[PDB]
Design a protein around this motif. Sequence first.
Motif, short mmCIF file in Angstrom:
data_model
loop_
_atom_site.label_atom_id
_atom_site.label_comp_id
_atom_site.label_asym_id
_atom_site.label_seq_id
_atom_site.Cartn_x
_atom_site.Cartn_y
_atom_site.Cartn_z
N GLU A 192 -1.89 11.44 14.77
CA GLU A 192 -1.41 10.06 14.69
C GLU A 192 -1.66 9.40 16.04
O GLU A 192 -1.55 10.04 17.08
N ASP A 230 -6.63 9.39 18.64
CA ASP A 230 -7.37 8.55 17.71
C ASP A 230 -8.22 9.53 16.95
O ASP A 230 -9.15 10.10 17.52
N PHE A 231 -7.91 9.73 15.68
CA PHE A 231 -8.66 10.67 14.85
C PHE A 231 -10.16 10.50 15.04
O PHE A 231 -10.87 11.47 15.26
N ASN A 271 -4.38 9.53 3.78
CA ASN A 271 -4.59 8.17 3.33
C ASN A 271 -5.06 7.48 4.60
O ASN A 271 -4.25 7.07 5.44
N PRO A 272 -6.38 7.37 4.77
CA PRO A 272 -6.97 6.75 5.95
C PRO A 272 -6.75 5.25 5.97
O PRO A 272 -6.43 4.66 4.95
N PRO A 273 -6.81 4.65 7.16
CA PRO A 273 -6.63 3.21 7.33
C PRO A 273 -7.74 2.46 6.60
O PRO A 273 -8.89 2.90 6.59
N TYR A 274 -7.39 1.35 5.96
CA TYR A 274 -8.37 0.54 5.26
C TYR A 274 -8.54 -0.72 6.10
O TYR A 274 -7.56 -1.41 6.38
N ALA A 318 -3.85 10.33 10.66
CA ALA A 318 -3.08 9.10 10.55
C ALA A 318 -1.81 9.38 9.75
O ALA A 318 -1.37 8.55 8.94
N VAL A 351 0.83 -1.25 0.00
CA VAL A 351 0.00 0.00 0.00
C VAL A 351 0.85 1.28 0.00
O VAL A 351 1.23 1.76 -1.07
N1 LIG Z 1 -7.65 5.56 14.53
C1 LIG Z 1 -6.54 6.14 14.11
N2 LIG Z 1 -6.28 7.42 14.45
C2 LIG Z 1 -5.15 7.98 14.03
N3 LIG Z 1 -4.18 7.46 13.30
C3 LIG Z 1 -4.47 6.19 12.99
C4 LIG Z 1 -5.59 5.48 13.34
N4 LIG Z 1 -5.49 4.16 12.92
C5 LIG Z 1 -4.34 4.14 12.35
N5 LIG Z 1 -3.64 5.30 12.34
C6 LIG Z 1 -2.28 5.58 11.85
O1 LIG Z 1 -2.27 5.85 10.44
C7 LIG Z 1 -1.04 5.35 9.89
C8 LIG Z 1 -1.30 4.52 8.64
C9 LIG Z 1 -2.32 4.99 7.60
N6 LIG Z 1 -2.16 6.44 7.28
C10 LIG Z 1 -2.07 4.14 6.35
C11 LIG Z 1 -3.24 4.04 5.39
C12 LIG Z 1 -3.14 2.86 4.42
N7 LIG Z 1 -4.03 3.08 3.28
C13 LIG Z 1 -3.51 1.55 5.12
O2 LIG Z 1 -4.50 0.91 4.71
O3 LIG Z 1 -2.80 1.15 6.06
C14 LIG Z 1 -0.36 4.51 10.96
O4 LIG Z 1 0.82 5.18 11.42
C15 LIG Z 1 -1.36 4.41 12.07
O5 LIG Z 1 -0.72 4.49 13.34
#
Ligand SMILES: Nc1ncnc2c1ncn2[C@@H]1O[C@H](C[C@@H](N)CC[C@H](N)C(=O)O)[C@@H](O)[C@H]1O
Length: 383
Positions: free
Chosen positions: A51, A69-70, A85-88, A27, A1
């Motif tokens: 983050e 936690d966002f 790029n939000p977590p998937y 994140a 990713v």
């Molecule tokens: N709930 C959350 N709040 C804030 N940051 C977060 C959260 N969940 C994950 N992260 C952070 O976001 C970062 C990774 C993401 N930006 C990556 C997105 C990528 N598309 C994926 O699917 O993993 C990591 O350093 C995590 O620690």
Amino acid sequence: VETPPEVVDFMVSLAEAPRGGRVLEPACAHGPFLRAFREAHGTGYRFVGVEIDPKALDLPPWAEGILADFLLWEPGEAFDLILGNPPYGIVFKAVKDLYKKAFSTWKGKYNLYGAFLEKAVRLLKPGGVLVFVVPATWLVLEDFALLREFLAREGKTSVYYLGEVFPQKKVSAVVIRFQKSGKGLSLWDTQESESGFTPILWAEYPHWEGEIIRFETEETRKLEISGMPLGDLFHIRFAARSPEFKKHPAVRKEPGPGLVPVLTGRNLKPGWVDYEKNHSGLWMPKERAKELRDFYATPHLVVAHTKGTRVVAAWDERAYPWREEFHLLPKEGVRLDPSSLVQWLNSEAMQKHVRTLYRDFVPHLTLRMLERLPVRREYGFHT
Ligand SMILES: Nc1ncnc2c1ncn2[C@@H]1O[C@H](C[C@@H](N)CC[C@H](N)C(=O)O)[C@@H](O)[C@H]1O
């Protein structure tokens, strides 16, 4: 990713914020978007990064880093631009309930990227802009229905198809640019080159209100117009799953005379069913299959959902028990010619129709995609 350089470059070129505005990267980790924006639009901005992991948060002195936690974060301010790029994905699960409670667009198992989108649109001030790189699944899946309505209701939405641009394949990405003011939906295509991505406007939907998003064309529209939806001629049923079969007193793990194999997607071919080869390891007396699903006793149409965004249809003339796939039962008053139907569904024109419209948004044919496939006039009709 990760986030390829060119993709980042693409998103920052769609980004805009008034001098002095607050720029946020959820994140962020080490702030890839924050740095890229600064290096492109200048330094006259208030930079913030949220983050959750102390070991990942690594931002420069000019940026305010916040460890939280966002999704649970609640600042006392609104932003002008939000890039990221939000977590998937999905998933001390008191947090899961917390999410459900706070997020109105939450439906089914949902996905974190959907939650990040709703939260982000809420921290947006009027006229604010959001630019995110996410999976294309929210375009057609039913679990994202409330989200699409949310976005349509909140502002103008621009969707840029990128496709499978991440190192790991089978994840079609799409860039969504959202402005919290106005309404509409513009669908854009992109051309990848030595220079990066070039946007190509595909179509605009000024009256978009949450409806499924597809790449329509003149051919697509004619076909759908000159024909009836498959969902109007048939009842789309689902098969029973292994546990159910493994719970039926008549089901055997070894063959025997009088025992019939429980079919799976590997038995379904384009135009025919391979009743011989067993792929489930389950066998049972054909006659008693009716005790799991009534329709198992009736010869009917089987369309696959395990073969990707492709239409593979066959007529189960013998009416064998299945462990999966889509099962179509005719509606009352519908007369049809099975042979012509199947031929039609497995045709090159049908494949192109489905592929033009839904590309690779999802790795399979969904009910919604299925039920609106056009059946030609002289095959099946209502009496
Ligand atoms: N709930 C959350 N709040 C804030 N940051 C977060 C959260 N969940 C994950 N992260 C952070 O976001 C970062 C990774 C993401 N930006 C990556 C997105 C990528 N598309 C994926 O699917 O993993 C990591 O350093 C995590 O620690």
